[PDB]
């Protein structure tokens, strides 16, 4: 057999023989993830197991789209695959997809919990921006960009793991909404700068060491947002569909708080004249990115030329060349066909 079977806690990993010394590093939604040594490449890898992803339209649509996009895109700030396999041999036997990529050191949650100098905080953000630039350059507007799905190496390098939104599921695990734009929360139209909102919830969180806009669902969460940023302006709501519009125009009012109040001097490496200039620079971007009305919110390319981010700029990283419903039966075939080719 090309394959061997280990009990990664509860479930069973049945992987190629090359992958030795498995250790559980990520349990979550579509997949269990393990770290491994790859004796063919002689490096460590992350290996994620899709357990029966055709089981429903949700798991399936994500699995397949992510499979599809994950082979067409070519950027170092966006996940690359090193290998994919099923240990089952026919479509009728088919069950599990295994997804293999470069092993990283930490996710962004863990990194957010740390004090970062400006050089790191900004280099991270420059990279989130390059990857989104890439996704956008191909027609993918992510819209659900969050730090539990972004990974980092000790040398401060970064990859985004997933490809965003296209949704019921019998589950323990809740979806994370906090980084979602007002357009997604209020079912609006949207454009490529919808992802900038997400980046600013991230940036803000790195500084604040607290989730900016938490909450139980879209009710608590729209609240947490207006009572910090203010009620939005008339012609923003002018773009809200009558029923959503009714609800918003009728919520309590707030003038909102200024950006030095939201992100006080306390929170910034601001000891030298360097970190003083960089601190005021960060807040200036923060306030261009935490902007409810997408019409007034900074673009991806403009943010890429903000002086806080501009120092890392590089054409090869920025202007890099770019690339329905089904039954469970039909998704299985779709997914099995991409896995095989
Ligand atoms: O405490 C530390 C946290 C970071 C961890 N390093 C790490 N490195 C690479 C990873 N790739 C994926 N997922 C994934 C994959 F494997 C293949 C894919 F096709 C797509 C993926 F999304 N994950 C998971 C684990 C948790 O965060 C996401 C990875 N985790 C080391 C331990």
C-alpha radius of gyration, the chain, whole number: 21
How many Cα neighbours within 13 Å face the side chain of 179?
25
Give the C-alpha separation, 178 to 221, whole Å: 7
Contact 325/301 with Cβ under 8 angstroms?
no
Give the C-alpha separation, 325 to 257, whole Å: 45
With CA atoms as reference, report the closest residue to 111 among 80, 150, 76: 150
Residue 3 in 3-state DSSP? strand
Which of 105, 138, 158 lies at the terminal end of a domain, its last residue? 105
What sign results for the dihedral spanned by CA atoms 21, 341, 162, 180? negative
Which of 51, 70, 105 lies at the terminal end of a domain, its last residue? 105
With CA atoms as reference, report the closest residue to 9 among 41, 37, 51, 40: 51
144 has catalytic annotation: yes
Structure token pair of residue 49: 């197991």
Give the C-alpha separation, 195 to 181, whole Å: 8
Phi and psi based region of residue 181 (left: phi greater than 0; alpha: psi -120 to 50; beta: remaining): beta
For ligand 1, whether the C-beta of 50 sits within 6 Å is no
Residue closest by Cα to atom 4 of ligand 1: 106
**Resolution to 1 decimal place, in Å:** 2.2
Those residues whose C-beta lies under 8 Å from the C-beta of residue 135, and which sit 6 or more positions away, are 73, 78, 141, 142, 160, 163, 164, 195
For ligand 1, whether the C-beta of 161 sits within 6 Å is yes
CA 141 from centroid of its chain's CA atoms: 11
Phi and psi based region of residue 265 (left: phi greater than 0; alpha: psi -120 to 50; beta: remaining): alpha
What sign results for the dihedral spanned by CA atoms 163, 167, 168, 173? positive
Alpha helices in 178-241, H assignment, sequence order: 182-185, 194-208, 218-229, 234-237
Residue 190 phi/psi, 5° resolution? -170, 160
> Does 223 lie in the same domain as 77?
no
For ligand 1, whether the C-beta of 211 sits within 6 Å is no
Q: Is 28 annotated as a binding residue?
A: yes
Alpha helices in the chain, H assignment, sequence order: 57-72, 108-112, 118-137, 182-185, 194-208, 218-229, 234-237, 242-249, 259-262, 273-289, 300-303, 307-310, 315-318, 328-340
Burial of 92 (0-12, 13-18, 19+ CB in 10 A): exposed
Residue 31 phi/psi, 5° resolution? -135, 150
With CA atoms as reference, report the closest residue to 13 among 71, 85, 62: 85
CA 256 from centroid of its chain's CA atoms: 27
Stated as kind and residue range, the H or E segment containing 19 is strand 19-27
Burial of 157 (0-12, 13-18, 19+ CB in 10 A): middle
Residue closest by Cα to atom 3 of ligand 1: 106
Give the C-alpha separation, 29 to 134, whole Å: 25
Determination approach: X-ray
Give the C-alpha separation, 279 to 308, whole Å: 9
Those residues whose C-beta lies under 8 Å from the C-beta of residue 167, and which sit 6 or more positions away, are 58
Q: How many folded domains does the chain comprise?
A: 2
Contact 135/141 with Cβ under 8 angstroms?
yes
Residue 14 in 3-state DSSP? strand
> Does 68 lie in the same domain as 35?
yes
CATH number, domain with residue 69: 3.30.200.20
Residue closest by Cα to atom 15 of ligand 1: 48
Give the C-alpha separation, 335 to 61, whole Å: 9
Within-domain flag for 332 = no
| Domain of residue 54, residue span | 3-105
Q: Tell me, what DSSP letter sits at residue 78? A: B
> Does 118 lie in the same domain as 16?
no
Give the C-alpha separation, 282 to 275, whole Å: 10
Q: Which strand ranges, in their side-by-side order, compose the sheet holding 106-107?
A: 106-107, 150-152, 158-160
Q: Tokens 């890429």, residue?
A: 304
With CA atoms as reference, report the closest residue to 82 among 19, 158, 155, 153: 19
For ligand 1, whether the C-beta of 116 sits within 6 Å is no
Within-domain flag for 20 = yes
For ligand 1, whether the C-beta of 104 sits within 6 Å is yes
> Does 117 lie in the same domain as 82?
no
Residue closest by Cα to atom 19 of ligand 1: 99
Cα 104 to middle of ligand 1, angstroms:
7
> Does 154 lie in the same domain as 55?
no
Q: After which residues is the chain broken (C to N over 2.5 A)?
A: 166, 323
> Does 302 lie in the same domain as 186?
yes
> Does 213 lie in the same domain as 128?
yes
Give the C-alpha separation, 149 to 266, whole Å: 29
> Does 218 lie in the same domain as 130?
yes
Residue 281 in 3-state DSSP? helix
> Does 275 lie in the same domain as 154?
yes
Structure token pair of residue 24: 């559980």
Cα 60 to middle of ligand 1, angstroms:
20
Give the C-alpha separation, 128 to 141, whole Å: 13
Contact 318/304 with Cβ under 8 angstroms?
yes
Contact 142/165 with Cβ under 8 angstroms?
yes
Q: Tokens 């600013």, residue?
A: 200
Give the C-alpha separation, 34 to 308, whole Å: 36
With CA atoms as reference, report the closest residue to 133 among 120, 145, 148, 115: 145
Catalytic residue among 144, 162, 195, 284: 144
> Does 170 lie in the same domain as 34?
no
């Amino acid at each position: 057999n090309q394959f061997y079977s280990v009990e990664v806690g509860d479930s069973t990993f049945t992987v190629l023989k090359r992958y030795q010394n498995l250790k559980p590093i990520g349990s979550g939604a579509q997949g269990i993830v393990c770290a491994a040594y790859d004796a063919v490449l002689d490096r460590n890898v992350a290996i994620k197991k899709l357990s029966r992803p055709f089981q429903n339209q949700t798991h399936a649509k994500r699995a397949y789209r992510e499979l599809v996009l994950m082979k067409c895109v070519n950027h170092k700030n966006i996940i690359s695959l090193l290998n994919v396999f099923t240990p089952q041999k026919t479509l009728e036997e088919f069950q599990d997809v295994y997804l293999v990529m470069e092993l990283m050191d930490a996710n962004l949650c863990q990194v957010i919990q740390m004090e970062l100098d400006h050089e790191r905080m900004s280099y991270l953000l420059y990279q989130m921006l390059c990857g989104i630039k890439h996704l956008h350059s191909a027609g993918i507007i992510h819209r659900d960009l969050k730090p539990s799905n972004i990974v980092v190496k000790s040398d401060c390098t970064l990859k985004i793991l997933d490809f965003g939104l296209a949704s019921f599921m019998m589950t323990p695990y809740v979806v994370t909404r906090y980084y979602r734009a007002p357009e997604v929360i209020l079912g609006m139209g949207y454009k490529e700068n919808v992802d900038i909102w997400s980046v600013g919830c991230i940036m803000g969180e790195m500084v604040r060491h607290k989730i900016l806009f938490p909450g139980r669902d879209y009710i608590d969460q729209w609240n947490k947002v207006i009572e910090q940023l203010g009620t939005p302006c008339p012609e923003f709501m002018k773009k809200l569909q009558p029923t959503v519009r009714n609800y918003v125009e009728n919520r309590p009012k707030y003038a909102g708080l200024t950006f030095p109040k939201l992100f006080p001097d306390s929170l910034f490496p601001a000891d030298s004249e360097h970190n003083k200039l960089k601190a005021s620079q960060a807040r200036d971007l923060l306030s261009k990115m935490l902007v409810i009305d997408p019409a007034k919110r900074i673009s991806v390319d403009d943010a890429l030329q903000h002086p806080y981010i501009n120092v890392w700029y590089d054409p090869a990283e920025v202007e890099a060349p770019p690339p329905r419903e089904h039954t469970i039966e039909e998704w299985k075939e779709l997914i099995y066909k991409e896995v095989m080719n």
